[PDB]
């Protein structure tokens, strides 16, 4: 209804991980894993 | 599936930018967050 | 418009033959304008666009 | 003597800043405008040229003789059209150049004034030191006296 | 796959060091130095392009994840001929509203002629209408008569769709030949051997 | 403008007629536009 | 007082370096481009003539 970011993009924030963590889809660890 | 999509950086960039300005306003600082006072010294 | 051979009066499309032109006209162009004005510091102008 | 130093520093700082302010004159903007506008306007003539030659394709002469038209005219026009395009393009470049030049000038003025600002701060420290020095001199006199 | 001669002056993380060693191994095999273990052309290209380095690998990943971040109206690939003119107006430098209005009105003016373009003829790339592309030519109603060509693919359908991707339509493109000497307002395009 | 306008009139008489350079006015107009640009550009210099 | 000196020196250094960085603007490059391109394009008219 009201105009706000999440209202425009309804999405559970819990469906995202914190940036910088190992859990990051682009963590340097993830890069290493891909390489491996 | 051990990873998840993280919050995309530009968003927190925005959040932080504004929060920084807000903080400077909290403490009467310049936009640069520098002290506005002359910080005089003596003994 | 109206359907060929006659029929239903119809809305301007966005697919097919001319979509790209509409995409500019109703998106890329206005957006470009505002973008440029932001770079131009005339933020008020950008806002209105 | 420190006051003189302060004055000159202050003036230097603020004068530069007054140049960072209002970093574009109305006349400068008008120049940029005129250049860009003229360049844009040149595009319109291309059509005119094409249509002119196209019209001149038709024959000229009637009666006991016929005299056609200047066969090469369209191709000649096309060549000149190309040249006209070049003319406009080249002219545009100028406007851009000048604009960016003013930008750089502003960058310079900004840095300049901010440095002067720092210097204006420094002299204050000198003032403080001199006051402490005065105190010390007084103490010396008092000691001699006693 | 590790350097023994480093001096004690250097410190690193375990992870980084491992990564370094892995990268060395990758590069060596890529360089076709170890026996066997060849690499496909694209596969190698991907490595030497971005996967060789974390920054670019991350950039690739991030682009896939959030393309919007990378979107920029000034960097559009698809771009109308006159769209070039429009930006070539706005890009002048410092700007004003009215001037932008003038520019966009010009663009709109040309767009009128676009909406008034009339097709003249077309030629098929080949016998299979249902997959061969085709080309078309058209001219302005307004004088002077100006001429343009464009093409359409018959491929680019979705396997499920009785329809084609928007991409199938090409942009309309200007023709530079001084055609006004034409005999009877008539022309034919031909595309062959990719010319 | 006046030059081309004058040149609109026919040139030839007698057992033949030969009209005039039909495109001349339009050609002149194009050049007129160019001349305007020329002046404008030159002015900018003085201001600068 | 030395701190003030440090600050001003730091700013001077980094500001200049920030000009050595990004030593060409997109607009500058665009200017060079436009000039070179136009010059090249002029060659084509010779044939036409």
Task: Report residue E58 as tokens.
Answer: 């991350």
Q: Which residues pair with E147 in a beta bridge?
A: E139
Please check whether residue G31 is in contact with residue D97, taking contact to mean a CB–CB distance below 8 angstroms: yes
Peptide bond into G2 cis (omega under 30): no
* Distance, CA of G27 to CA of G30 (rounded, Å): 5
List helix spans (H) across chain C: 19-23, 29-39, 43-48
Subunits close to D (at least 3 CB pairs below 8 A) = B, E, F, G
Please check whether residue D109 is in contact with residue D23, taking contact to mean a CB–CB distance below 8 angstroms: yes
Judged by phi (left if over 0) then psi (alpha if -120 to 50, else beta), residue E187 lies in beta
Q: D67, exposed or middle or buried, with CB in 10 Å at 0-12, 13-18, 19+?
A: middle
Encode D91-113: b = buried (16+ Cβ within 10 Å), e = exposed: bbbbbbbbbbebbeeeeebbbbb
* Distance, CA of D132 to CA of A9 (rounded, Å): 64
* Distance, CA of G49 to CA of G45 (rounded, Å): 6
| CB contact E102 to C (< 8 Å) | no
Residues in chain F: 48
List helix spans (H) across E116-159: none
Q: D87, exposed or middle or buried, with CB in 10 Å at 0-12, 13-18, 19+?
A: buried
Q: With contacts defined as CB-CB under 8 Å, which chain A residues touch B3? A: 17, 23-25, 27, 30
Experimental method: cryo-EM
Sequence-distant contacts of D16-22: CB under 8 A, at least 24 apart: D16/D109, D16/D112, D16/D113, D16/D116, D17/D113, D17/D117, D19/D109, D19/D113, D20/D106, D20/D109, D20/D110, D20/D113
* Distance, CA of E74 to CA of C38 (rounded, Å): 13
* Distance, CA of D42 to CA of F35 (rounded, Å): 10
Across the interface, of F15, F19, F34, the residue whose CB is closest to D42 is F34
Q: With contacts defined as CB-CB under 8 Å, which chain G residues touch D126? A: 1
Task: Report residue E138 as tokens.
Answer: 């058209």
Q: With contacts defined as CB-CB under 8 Å, which chain E residues touch A25? A: 61, 65
Residues with their C more than 2.5 Å from the N of the next written residue in chain F, i.e. before a break, are: none
Please check whether residue E193 is in contact with residue E167, taking contact to mean a CB–CB distance below 8 angstroms: no
DSSP conformation letters of B4-42:
BPBPPHHHHHHHHHHHHHHHHHHTT--TT---SS-----
Encode E69-89: b = buried (16+ Cβ within 10 Å), e = exposed: eeeebeebeeebebbebbbbb
* Distance, CA of C39 to CA of C43 (rounded, Å): 8
Alpha-carbon distance B39 to nearest alpha carbon in chain A (angstroms): 38
E strand or H helix at E90, and its extent? helix E81-90
Nearest chain B residue to D135, by CA: B43
Contacting residues for C20 by C-beta, under 8 A, at least 6 apart = E78, E80, E166, E169, E171
Q: Tokens 């709109």 label which residue?
A: E108
Listed resolution, Å: 4.6
Beta strands D62-63 and E118-124: pairing type? unpaired
Q: E109, exposed or middle or buried, with CB in 10 Å at 0-12, 13-18, 19+?
A: exposed
Chain C and chain E share a number of CB contacts under 8 A equal to: 51
Angle at G46 between CA G42 and CA G49, to 5 degrees: 125
* Distance, CA of G31 to CA of E89 (rounded, Å): 14
Nearest chain E residue to B8, by CA: E66
Q: With contacts defined as CB-CB under 8 Å, which chain F residues touch D42? A: 33-34, 37
Q: With contacts defined as CB-CB under 8 Å, which chain D residues touch E92? A: 32, 36, 92, 95-96, 99
Judged by phi (left if over 0) then psi (alpha if -120 to 50, else beta), residue E97 lies in alpha
How remote is the C-alpha of D81 from its chain's centroid?
31
Angle at D137 between CA D135 and CA D143, to 5 degrees: 105
Tell me which residue of G43, D57, D79 sits closest to E177, measured CA to CA: D79
Cα pseudo-dihedral E60, E62, E64, E69, rounded to 10? -120
First to last CA, chain D: 31
* Distance, CA of C36 to CA of C26 (rounded, Å): 16
Across the interface, of D49, D62, D67, the residue whose CB is closest to F27 is D49
How remote is the C-alpha of D2 from its chain's centroid?
38
* Distance, CA of C18 to CA of E114 (rounded, Å): 10
* Distance, CA of E83 to CA of D96 (rounded, Å): 19
Mutate which of C1, C12, C30, C36 to test chain E, going by most E C-beta atoms within 10 A? C36
């Amino acid at each position: 209804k009201l105009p706000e970011y999440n209202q425009l993009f309804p999405e559970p924030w819990d469906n995202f991980c914190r940036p910088g963590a190992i859990e990051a889809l682009d963590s340097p660890a993830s890069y290493l894993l891909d390489l491996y | 599936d051990i990873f998840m999509y993280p919050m995309n950086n530009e968003l927190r960039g925005l959040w932080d930018r504004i929060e920084n300005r807000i903080y400077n306003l909290r403490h009467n600082l310049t936009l640069d967050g520098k002290e506005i006072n002359m910080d005089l010294y003596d003994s | 418009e109206e359907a060929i051979l006659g029929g239903a009066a119809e809305l301007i499309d966005l697919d097919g033959a001319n979509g790209i032109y509409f995409w500019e006209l109703f998106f890329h162009m206005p957006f470009m304008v505002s973008w440029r004005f932001n770079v131009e510091q005339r933020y008020e102008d950008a806002n209105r666009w | 003597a420190l006051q003189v130093s302060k004055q000159s520093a202050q003036d230097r700082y603020d004068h530069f800043k007054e140049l960072y302010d209002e970093n574009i004159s109305s006349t400068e903007q008008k120049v940029i405008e005129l250049q860009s506008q003229a360049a844009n306007s040149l595009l319109m003539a291309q059509g005119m040229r094409t249509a002119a030659a196209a019209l001149d394709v038709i024959p000229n002469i009637y009666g006991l003789a016929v005299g056609g038209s200047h066969w090469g005219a369209p191709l000649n026009a096309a060549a000149e059209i190309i040249m006209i395009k070049y003319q406009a393009d080249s002219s545009k470049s100028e406007s851009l150049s000048v604009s960016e030049s003013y930008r750089r000038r502003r960058q310079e003025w900004e840095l300049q004034y901010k440095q002067a600002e720092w210097e204006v701060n420094s002299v204050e420290q000198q003032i403080n030191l001199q006051n402490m020095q005065i105190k010390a001199a007084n103490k010396r006199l008092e000691q001699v006296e006693a | 796959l590790l350097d023994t001669q480093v001096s004690a002056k250097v410190i690193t993380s375990r992870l980084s060091l491992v990564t370094q060693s892995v990268q060395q191994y990758i590069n060596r095999i890529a360089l076709n130095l170890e026996p066997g273990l060849s690499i496909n052309q694209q596969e190698a290209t991907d490595w030497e392009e971005f996967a060789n380095r974390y920054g670019y690998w991350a950039a690739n990943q991030q682009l896939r994840m959030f393309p919007e971040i990378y979107v920029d109206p000034t960097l559009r690939l698809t771009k109308t001929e006159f769209f070039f003119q429009l930006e070539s107006a706005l890009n002048q430098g410092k700007l004003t509203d009215d001037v932008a209005q003038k520019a966009v009105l010009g663009y709109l003016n040309n767009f009128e002629e676009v909406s008034n373009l009339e097709i003249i003829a077309g030629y098929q790339d080949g016998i299979d209408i249902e997959n061969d592309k085709t080309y078309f030519v058209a001219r302005t109603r307004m004088q002077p008569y100006r001429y343009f060509w464009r093409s359409l693919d018959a491929s680019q359908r979705n396997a499920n769709s009785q329809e084609l991707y928007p991409t199938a339509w090409s942009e309309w493109k200007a023709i530079s030949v001084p055609l006004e000497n034409v005999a009877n307002g008539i022309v034919r395009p031909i595309m062959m051997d990719n010319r």
